[PDB]
Design a protein around this ligand. Structure first.
Ligand SMILES: [Zn+2]
Lengths: 75, 131, 92, 101, 184, 119, 124
RNA sequence: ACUUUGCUCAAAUUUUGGAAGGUCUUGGUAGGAACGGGUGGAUCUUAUAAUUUUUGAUUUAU
RNA sequence: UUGGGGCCCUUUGUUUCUUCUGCCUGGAGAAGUUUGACACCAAAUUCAAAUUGGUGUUAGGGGAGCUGGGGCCUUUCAAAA
RNA sequence: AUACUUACCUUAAGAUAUCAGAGGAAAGUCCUACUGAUCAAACAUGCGCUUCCAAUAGUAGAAGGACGUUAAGCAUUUAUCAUUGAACUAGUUCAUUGAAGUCAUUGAUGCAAACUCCUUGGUCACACACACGGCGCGGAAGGCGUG
């Protein structure tokens, strides 16, 4: 019905937690009413910052159902 | 067979009132639990150490005083020198107790076992007290 | 419904969150929608295992929210008036 | 064609079609023919029963229900059976329902 | 639908996130609502508890023990008096609400890090928020970069001596009459 | 057709509402909401004992059961008795209705006939 | 303890102190004020009680005394998704007659407001 | 079953319903009736069993 | 009308229905009661009133009248046995 | 409050108890302050209906709390990972480099008691009355029934 308001967030590098365990960081591109969020330059954060972190793809889309909290690390 | 005074009148349910009264006498007795209460028929014990049955009416004459009966007379007195004229207190009040002028009715069932005429006499003199 | 309208009435005030993941986000509420998804400002975060951090801005999905703690003085707020008298609506 | 365009009666004809011609026709043909059905829930135990009624959400009213549930701890198994005369089953728990021969 | 704003009591037709967001931020709605919670908040202090009294029958002992104790006199002000004294007391409570002694900020005014901490606009925790807290400013400073190199000697006819500690108005006659030394 | 409209005619009957937790509720039934929210009156709600040489029961259902305030201290097994429990609809798994009532009278929906009688 | 009206729905009961059960095994006790279509409700002064993992072994079948760790959180708004069942703890600070009185006085005052507003708008 | 005649050993009673008066007890005591709407809020039916609440990923499992 | 006694005065802003007067050697007196009055909160100026926007109070007890309901008694009537 | 300027935007749909019978405009619909049954709400009103409503013939007691003290109470269990070098048994100590790292160890878990303090109630009337388990006036909360 109503579109979520991410309007200040887009183009800013954002960390968001996928399900319980995972945390993905990427530059937010677009979003929809289900809060499906597509972002680019995705990286999967882990305990060891440079080591266990591995990039996903040039463009990644996320189902809004697996989104828990969304924090922007940015202005 | 024992007689009390100035007990709380306010609980209106005999099985709840015997819960309260029994609760003040013996903490951690059989019945702090409240699944059930025993009911011996006229002619088993309520609590250990002498207690057998409890009797309360609602009548304006008997209002505040409720009577207790015991297994035997020496245990009935043994309850009295348990406190030895050191007044226990039920809910709000110290009670003043004494020996009952009339013998315990369920104690008569134990005595004569060791009683139809009494039940006839009670119906007759009750019929006359109605007059 | 009234429960969501009270959340809209809590904008600009410090609120607490419990996500169904077990975390706790306490901080100032910037935005809220009718889908109960809210975004908070200058918030202190408590992980499910107790580790506490601080983040400047957060957006959470309403489906993952469990309870929201709202400043107590909103209890007497006009939403809870049972018998209330509204004027006639404008004709458009 | 989406459902919000249709009128009040077109939804009734749509549900009549879906029950008569469709997947749930397996249950419907099972209700009329008095054929016992096997139902697996997501709770992981299975009822052998007979369907007196069913519905869109798949919740269904049953008669002579026989529930079969096994449990194991450290690979020690026991099979338990529980009989019921009549039952009402909410449809979200079920996964597979088969029609016995 | 229509969004009824019960603070302003005025309807707004066909609620939308834009129009509703504009109304809620509106100045008039702001004043109305803020005043509303000012009243609803002043009421709980204004409302008297009026707890119920349970009177028991005084016993024969304490009536005799309390009869030998003499009866104390009670003082009751006139209506014209009690109105004024209630006004004064309430205005004193409002005073104790707003006091918030800051003197520490007055002490460190010339400290080398005074600009990074007590200015509170340029801080870290609260710094970024104040910018978004600035009003829309529709129509009609102390930068952080300061160093110790400014004001090298804190006293060159610059500072005012520390303000004297306050005193209660009631007991103001309690003060020692004369000082120990001669001030200019 | 909404089969929940059947449950609304089961009012004032002894019933067991067997939930997703495994918790079972015996009680007298009152009005059932269209979302299948089921409100009961005098209820004894408990958990079954899987035997299997001490298989730990549901850990969440024991806590939720003690936290109703209706579990009495001296109960040996795991049960609670209380008045007026209101149950959300999505929590229900099975409903065991009494053997006495006849379905042929109650399973007739008046809207289903009303649609056919009118056409 | 407390006898709830034999037929009473969630709308009939307001301001009663309730006891709310969630999916996670914790309880929110407090006065209900509002609720909603999907049954997410608003509690006034509420305290969440929790049975720790260490006390839980005490509830398994054999007078039990459970230490229930609880924390106080005022004026919350629950979510209908989490709610499991609801029970009544106490009855409101006011009787039924008194609530009828305050309801009638509140309604009369509400009408007086509409008249004072209408006649303040009309003449000026 | 009803009526009349022979022999022997309209009046009164009860239940239900209506009218009046008396007594006891309790409640109300300033708004109420009718009519009317491009009126509010509650409830119900359908969109609506398809990611944001009610047609299932928290009985911790192999 | 006076006197004596009892209990209460936390009614804490000394009976809390307002306003004004007033009180412990006392329990009082005056005016007023919903298209109104009173209290209070907020402002910016003027410069102590009002202005505009808001929240709240207008209560309790008894009796007479009138009116609704219930139980009982007596009388009148209709039906049935 | 009025006038002007600018910005933001506009109607999910339907319905208001059910069933049955008689009537008005072969099928169906609508309607009848029409007739019956059932259901629901409000208002009254009753039940030898059920439960509860605290000491003053005394310095008490009941329910519920403390996000109170004793209290560092008593009894337990815990304090990061990776790389390089030295010594060492055949894992251990020290030093250096990197990563993250809720605070607490007077903690956390279990066990129990004592004390202190808060909120609440008709702290009503009659009665101090040898019974076989009532029929004082009210208030609170229910169940059942009639109108
Ligand atoms: Zn507004």
């Amino acid at each position: 019905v109503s579109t979520p308001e991410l309007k200040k967030y887009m183009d800013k590098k954002i960390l968001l937690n996928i399900n319980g365990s995972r945390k993905v960081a990427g530059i937010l591109r677009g979003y929809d009413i289900f809060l499906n969020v597509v972002l680019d330059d995705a990286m999967e954060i882990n305990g060891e910052d440079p080591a266990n972190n591995h990039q996903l793809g040039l463009q990644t889309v996320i189902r809004g159902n697996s989104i828990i909290s969304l924090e922007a690390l940015d202005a | 067979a024992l007689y009390f005074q100035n007990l709380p009148s306010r609980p209106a349910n005999k099985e709840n009132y015997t819960r309260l009264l029994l609760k003040h006498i013996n903490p951690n007795n059989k019945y702090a639990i409240n699944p059930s209460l025993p009911l011996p028929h006229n002619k088993l014990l309520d609590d250990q150490m002498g207690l057998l049955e409890v009797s309360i009416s609602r009548s304006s004459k008997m209002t505040n005083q409720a009577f207790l009966t015991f297994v035997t007379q020496e245990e009935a007195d043994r309850f009295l020198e348990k406190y030895t004229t050191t007044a226990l207190k039920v809910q709000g009040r110290k009670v003043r107790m004494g020996k009952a002028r009339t013998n315990s009715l369920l104690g008569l069932s134990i005595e004569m076992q060791k009683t139809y005429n009494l039940d006839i006499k009670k119906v007759l003199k009750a019929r006359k007290l109605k007059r | 419904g009234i429960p969501v309208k009270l959340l809209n009435e809590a904008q600009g005030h410090i609120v607490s969150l419990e996500l169904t993941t077990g975390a706790t986000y306490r901080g100032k509420l910037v935005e809220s929608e009718d889908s109960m998804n809210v975004q908070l400002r200058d918030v202190i975060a408590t992980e499910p295992q107790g580790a506490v951090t601080h983040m400047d801005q957060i957006f959470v999905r309403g489906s993952q929210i469990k309870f929201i703690v709202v400043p107590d003085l909103l209890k007497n707020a006009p939403l809870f008036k049972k018998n209330s008298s509204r004027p006639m609506p404008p004709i458009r | 064609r989406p459902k919000h365009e249709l009128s009040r009666a077109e939804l009734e004809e749509l549900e009549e079609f879906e029950f008569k011609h469709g997947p749930m026709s397996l249950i419907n043909d099972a209700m009329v023919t008095r054929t016992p059905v096997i139902i697996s829930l997501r709770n992981n135990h299975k009822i052998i029963a007979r369907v007196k009624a069913f519905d869109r959400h798949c919740n269904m009213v049953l008669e002579n229900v026989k529930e079969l549930w096994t449990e194991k701890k450290g690979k020690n198994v026991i099979n338990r059976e529980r009989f019921i005369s009549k039952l009402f089953l909410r449809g979200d728990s079920v996964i597979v329902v088969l029609k016995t021969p | 639908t229509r969004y009824y704003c019960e603070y302003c009591h005025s309807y707004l037709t066909h609620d939308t996130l834009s129009v509703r967001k504009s109304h809620l931020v509106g100045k008039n709605h702001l004043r109305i609502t803020a005043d509303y919670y000012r009243n609803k908040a002043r009421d709980i202090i204004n409302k008297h508890n009026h707890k119920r009294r349970h009177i028991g029958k005084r016993g024969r002992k304490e009536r005799e023990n309390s009869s030998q104790n003499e009866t104390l006199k009670v003082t009751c002000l006139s209506n014209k008096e009690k109105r004024h004294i209630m006004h004064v007391k309430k205005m004193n409570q409002k005073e104790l609400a707003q006091t918030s002694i800051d003197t520490l900020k007055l002490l460190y005014d010339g400290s080398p890090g005074y600009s990074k901490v007590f200015v509170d606009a340029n801080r870290f925790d609260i710094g970024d928020l104040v910018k978004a807290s600035k009003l829309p400013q529709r129509a009609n400073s102390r930068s952080r970069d300061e160093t110790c190199e400014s004001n090298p000697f804190p006293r060159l006819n610059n500072p005012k001596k520390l303000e004297p500690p306050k005193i209660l108005s009631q007991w103001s006659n309690t003060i020692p009459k004369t000082s120990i030394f001669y001030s200019v | 057709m909404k089969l929940v409209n059947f449950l609304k005619k089961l009012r004032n009957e002894q019933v067991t509402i067997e939930l997703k937790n495994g918790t079972t509720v015996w009680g007298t039934l009152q009005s059932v909401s269209p979302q299948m929210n089921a409100i009961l009156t005098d209820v004894k709600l408990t958990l079954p004992q899987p035997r299997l040489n001490k298989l730990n029961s549901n850990g969440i259902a024991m806590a939720s059961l003690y936290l109703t305030g209706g579990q009495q201290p001296t109960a040996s097994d795991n049960i609670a008795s209380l008045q007026y429990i209101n149950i959300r609809g999505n929590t229900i798994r099975q409903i065991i209705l009494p053997d006495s009532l006849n379905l042929d009278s109650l399973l007739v929906d008046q809207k289903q006939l009303n649609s056919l009688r009118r056409s | 303890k407390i006898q709830v009206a034999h037929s009473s729905r969630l709308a009939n009961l307001i301001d009663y102190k309730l006891r709310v059960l969630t999916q996670d095994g914790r309880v929110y006790i407090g006065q209900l004020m509002a609720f909603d279509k999907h049954m997410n409700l608003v509690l006034n002064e509420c305290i969440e009680e929790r049975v720790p993992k260490t006390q839980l072994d005490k509830l398994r079948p054999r007078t039990l005394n459970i230490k229930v760790e609880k924390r106080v959180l005022g004026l919350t708004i629950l979510r209908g998704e989490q709610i499991l069942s609801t029970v009544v703890e106490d009855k409101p600070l006011l009787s039924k007659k008194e609530r009828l009185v305050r309801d009638k006085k509140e309604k009369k005052q509400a009408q007086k407001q509409t008249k004072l507003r209408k006649e303040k708008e009309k003449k000026p």
